Design a protein around this motif. Structure first.
Motif, PDB file in Angstrom:
ATOM      1  N   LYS A   1      -4.840  -3.766  11.262  1.00  5.40           N
ATOM      2  CA  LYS A   1      -3.953  -5.184  12.257  1.00  5.40           C
ATOM      3  C   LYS A   1      -4.316  -5.818  12.896  1.00  5.40           C
ATOM      4  O   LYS A   1      -4.678  -6.127  14.087  1.00  5.40           O
ATOM      5  CB  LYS A   1      -2.869  -4.824  13.028  1.00  5.40           C
TER       6      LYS A   1
ATOM      7  N   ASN B   1       0.937  -1.603  -0.291  1.00  5.63           N
ATOM      8  CA  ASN B   1      -0.280   0.341  -0.350  1.00  5.63           C
ATOM      9  C   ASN B   1       0.730   1.270  -0.733  1.00  5.63           C
ATOM     10  O   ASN B   1       0.852   2.129   0.500  1.00  5.63           O
ATOM     11  CB  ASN B   1      -0.507  -0.365   0.904  1.00  5.63           C
TER      12      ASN B   1
ATOM     13  N   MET C   1      -5.116  -3.917   7.211  1.00 12.38           N
ATOM     14  CA  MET C   1      -4.145  -2.225   7.244  1.00 12.38           C
ATOM     15  C   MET C   1      -4.908  -2.056   8.976  1.00 12.38           C
ATOM     16  O   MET C   1      -3.729  -1.697   9.567  1.00 12.38           O
ATOM     17  CB  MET C   1      -5.219  -1.269   6.475  1.00 12.38           C
TER      18      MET C   1
ATOM     19  N   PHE D   1       0.678  -2.790   8.755  1.00 11.87           N
ATOM     20  CA  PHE D   1      -0.112  -3.112   8.047  1.00 11.87           C
ATOM     21  C   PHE D   1       0.407  -4.571   9.068  1.00 11.87           C
ATOM     22  O   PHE D   1       1.122  -5.292   9.665  1.00 11.87           O
ATOM     23  CB  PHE D   1       0.168  -3.824   6.409  1.00 11.87           C
ATOM     24  N   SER D   2      -1.261  -5.753   8.769  1.00 18.08           N
ATOM     25  CA  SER D   2      -1.220  -6.962   9.199  1.00 18.08           C
ATOM     26  C   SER D   2       0.896  -7.883   8.668  1.00 18.08           C
ATOM     27  O   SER D   2       0.896  -8.326   8.212  1.00 18.08           O
ATOM     28  CB  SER D   2      -1.865  -7.714   9.423  1.00 18.08           C
TER      29      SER D   2
END
Length: 213
Positions: free
Chosen positions: A130, A18, A128, A51-52
């Motif tokens: 998480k 992203n 996003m 992010f995750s």
């Protein structure tokens, strides 16, 4: 043998998700014949990741797979020359990750050069936000396609709260030499983030993998 029962692991991942660039370096070890591997990973650039971390874990080598003698081992046979792979992970809500990895060997170590690009993740989606907990155990279906090996997985991320988010994996594995090709078979995986610090700057990943008929 060329592949020792205990092999070290060294890797580097250049990624961008992203639009957010980052670099992660890793050092680990595994038991190729037992199908287990563990890697300690540090974010060298781009911390803290927004992010995750779970979308990255599978990118962090099927040489680490327990195989029966009767199913040709596409991965192990490729050495010492090695092999490379390209993967597409298609998420339930439009997010997509494309990854490529080159696996080589140096003495008793496997070295990976990884490149990952993730895009289109929804701002208010679990990646996003998480909100992922872990990958559920999975079964990868492997078969030959156009002279190389393909792996398909109908995967799922377990989310905080108990829900799931589908992720379809397609990976193409390419040995760097001619090897005996196997008939279709399966690989059961279990991958876990054993531990991590607050923002996942320091993480230890573990995976178990077993081939079956």
């Amino acid at each position: 043998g060329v592949i020792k029962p205990d092999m070290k692991i060294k890797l580097k991942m250049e990624g961008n998700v992203n639009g957010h660039a980052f670099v992660i370096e890793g050092e680990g070890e595994g038991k190729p014949y037992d199908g287990t591997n563990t890697i300690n990973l540090e974010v060298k650039e781009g911390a803290p990741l927004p992010f995750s971390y779970d979308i990255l874990t599978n990118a962090f080598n099927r040489a680490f797979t327990k195989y029966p003698d009767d199913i040709p081992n596409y991965f192990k046979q490729s050495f010492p020359e090695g092999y490379s792979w390209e993967r597409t992970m298609t998420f339930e809500d439009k997010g997509i990750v494309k990854v490529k990895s080159d696996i080589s060997m140096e003495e008793d170590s496997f070295i990976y050069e990884i490149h990952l690009k993730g895009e289109n993740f929804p701002p208010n989606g679990p990646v996003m936000q998480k909100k992922t907990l872990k990958w559920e155990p999975s079964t990868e279906i492997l078969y030959v396609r156009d002279g190389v090996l393909v792996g398909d997985i109908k995967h799922k991320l377990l989310l905080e709260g108990g829900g799931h988010h589908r992720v379809d994996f397609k990976t193409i594995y390419r040995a760097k030499k001619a090897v005996k090709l196997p008939d279709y078979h399966f690989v059961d995986h279990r991958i876990e983030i054993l531990n991590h610090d607050k923002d996942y700057n320091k993480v230890t990943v573990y995976e178990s993998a077993v081939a079956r008929y």
